[PDB]
């Protein structure tokens, strides 16, 4: 019967590895939350980047021609040298 007791004692030998697995499973289930975080960061930090990187980050969809008709810097609406 000590044999039975040996197994019943040993069934919990690897507690540290089981608790690590549980927390990894939690971390796995949080990974999908990146799909909303990373874009939201770039959305807020877009204006910090330079014009050249704004274009790459958007795959060319944004460029200087896409700056508003009334750009926040009035002297640079329609380009760095103005409209004409």
Partner 1 sequence: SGFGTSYAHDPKWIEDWMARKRVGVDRMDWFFRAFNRLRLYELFFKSTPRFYAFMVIGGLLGSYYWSRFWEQYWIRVNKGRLYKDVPYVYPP
Ligand X SMILES: CCCCCCCC/C=C\CCCCCCCC(=O)OC[C@H](COP(=O)(O)OCCN)OC(=O)CCCCCCC/C=C\CCCCCCCC
Ligand Y SMILES: CCCCCCCCCCCCCCCCCC(=O)OC[C@H](COP(=O)([O-])OCC[N+](C)(C)C)OC(=O)CCCCCCCCCCCCCCCCC
**CA distances for 18 relative to 15, 24, 53, 59, angstroms:** 5, 10, 45, 44
- Closer to ligand X by CB, 13 or 73: give it: 73
Q: How far is the CB of 50 from ligand X (least distance, A)?
A: 5
- Judged by CB under 8 A, does residue 78 bind partner 1? yes
Q: Are 46 and 55 in contact (CB under 8 A)?
A: no
Query: Site residues for ligand Y, window 41-70 (CB under 6 A)?
Result: 52-53, 55-56, 59-60
User: Footprint of ligand X on this chain (CB under 6 A)?
Assistant: 44-45, 47-48, 50
């Amino acid at each position: 019967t000590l044999a039975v007791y040996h197994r019943l004692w040993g069934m919990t030998e690897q507690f540290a590895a089981r608790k690590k697995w549980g927390w990894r499973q939690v971390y796995h289930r949080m990974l999908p939350f990146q799909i909303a975080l990373y874009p939201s960061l770039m959305w807020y930090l877009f204006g910090w980047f330079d014009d050249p990187y704004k274009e790459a980050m958007t795959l060319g969809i944004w460029n200087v021609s896409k700056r508003s008709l009334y750009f926040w810097d009035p002297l640079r609406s329609g380009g760095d040298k103005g409209w004409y």
